[PDB]
Structure 1
Amino acid sequence: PLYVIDKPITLHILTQLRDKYTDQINFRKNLVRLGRILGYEISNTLDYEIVEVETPLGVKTKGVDITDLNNIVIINILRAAVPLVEGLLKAFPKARQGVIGASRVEVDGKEVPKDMDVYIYYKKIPDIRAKVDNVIIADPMIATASTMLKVLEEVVKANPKRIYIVSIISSEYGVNKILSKYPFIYLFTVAIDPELNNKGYILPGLGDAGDRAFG
């Protein structure tokens, strides 16, 4: 499943993120704000149950209960993902969090890269209950999808109920590379940009997330 959340407000925020004239502080704040929104969006795709509920007026009426809100595990790739994850956590108060610090190797090639090398420097995750937990992996940018793939390479092992991916911008290349390998993934993104350059950056994109957030 591919979800492109292009509502006014998310595009508005995305514009600010794209704007090279946005300082790191506001860059991060916007990233958190988006995380919260994308969380809301994911919420409505979550599996839920119909229930009945009684009101103070002594009458019963039917309602909804997204019990799955207790079966969420957010994976923090770290670095630029932090502010985004922060937003997601605010969205899912009862979510557990694990971290899989992965970093692709920045390299300048002759052609547009198809894959980068990614390494997991730190891993500490909660226990992902197979068939029960909804796992959400966040990463502001998905270029060659190499980073996401490395993380997924082992989130899938746990066989979660669902696996959501959340990013601000994903390249057409990355999106296809991921969904063709794991068609069951719910991929959420604010925008899908057309191309990558020789260094592996999304165009137009918004520059290097890490630098835009901490530089």
Structure 2
Amino acid sequence: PLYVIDKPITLHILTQLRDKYTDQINFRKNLVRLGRILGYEISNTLDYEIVEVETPLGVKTKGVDITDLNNIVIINILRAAVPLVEGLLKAFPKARQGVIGASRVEVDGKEVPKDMDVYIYYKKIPDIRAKVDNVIIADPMIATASTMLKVLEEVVKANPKRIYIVSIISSEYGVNKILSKYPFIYLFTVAIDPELNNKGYILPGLGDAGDRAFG
């Protein structure tokens, strides 16, 4: 499933991120806001049960109980994903966190990359309950989707109940590459951009998340 959250407020933030005149302080600020928001959207796609509670006025009433909110694991890719994950964690107060330090080897070429090398420098993940936990992986950008598929190689084994991928911008090439391999993955993103340049950068994109966040 592909959820493109393009509501006025998320598109308003995306425009601040895209704008090159935005400094890293405000850039990181929005990522935290968007992870907050995107987290809410994801909340509304979870499994809920119909329950009954008694109000103060003795009256019994029917309400919902999203049992899944107690089975969430958010994996942080680090780098630009930190402000984002900081936002998601705000929305899922009961989520455990894991980190899979992934970074693609940025190559310069004469053609548009359809694939890139990805190295993993750090790995600390919580136990993932099979058929129970909902895993959320954050990545500000998805270009060739090489970074994402690399982290997935492992997450997918755990066989979590669900798998969500949050990103700000995704390239058409990337969404299709990921969802054609794991179409069961709920992929959230505020927008999808057309192409990748010869360095594997999304166009129009927003630049190098890492550079925008800590430059």
TM-score range for the pair, normalised by the shorter chain length:
over 0.9
Normalization by structure 2: what TM-score?
A: 1.00
d(CA) in 2 for partners of 1:192 and 1:71? 29
Query: Percent of aligned pairs with the same residue?
Result: 100
- SS of residue paired to 2:167: strand
For each residue in 1:110-155, what CA deviation from the matched residue of structure 2 results, as whole angstroms up to 9, or x when unmatched?
A: 1110011101100000000010000000000000000000000110
- SS of residue paired to 1:29: helix
- SS of residue paired to 1:101: strand
d(CA) in 1 for partners of 2:12 and 2:151? 29
Structure 1 residue 109, shift from structure 2 partner: 1.0
For each residue in 1:46-80, what CA deviation from the matched residue of structure 2 results, as whole angstroms up to 9, or x when unmatched?
A: 11111011101110110011010000000000011
d(CA) in 1 for partners of 2:109 and 2:45? 39
d(CA) in 2 for partners of 1:131 and 1:4? 26
Unaligned runs of 5+ in 1: none
d(CA) in 1 for partners of 2:24 and 2:106? 21
Normalization by structure 1: what TM-score?
A: 1.00
d(CA) in 2 for partners of 1:131 and 1:120? 26
d(CA) in 2 for partners of 1:53 and 1:79? 43
Tell me whether 1:59 sits opposite 2:71 in the alignment: no
d(CA) in 1 for partners of 2:69 and 2:146? 29
- SS of residue paired to 2:89: helix
Unaligned runs of 5+ in 2: none
Structure 1 residue 162, shift from structure 2 partner: 0.2
Corresponding residue pairs, total = 215
- SS of residue paired to 1:33: helix
Structure 1 residue 178, shift from structure 2 partner: 0.1
Structure 1 residue 43, shift from structure 2 partner: 0.1
Deviating above 6 A after TM superposition, structure 1's stretches of 4 or more consecutive aligned residues are: none
For each residue in 1:19-57, what CA deviation from the matched residue of structure 2 results, as whole angstroms up to 9, or x when unmatched?
A: 000000000000000000000000000111110111011
d(CA) in 2 for partners of 1:46 and 1:96? 17
d(CA) in 2 for partners of 1:54 and 1:38? 32
d(CA) in 2 for partners of 1:189 and 1:39? 11
Matches within 5 A, 1:74-93: 74-93=74-93
- SS of residue paired to 2:21: coil
For each residue in 1:95-118, what CA deviation from the matched residue of structure 2 results, as whole angstroms up to 9, or x when unmatched?
A: 000000000001111111001110
d(CA) in 2 for partners of 1:210 and 1:19? 15
- SS of residue paired to 1:53: strand
d(CA) in 1 for partners of 2:48 and 2:78? 30
**Alignment root-mean-square deviation, CA:** 0.4
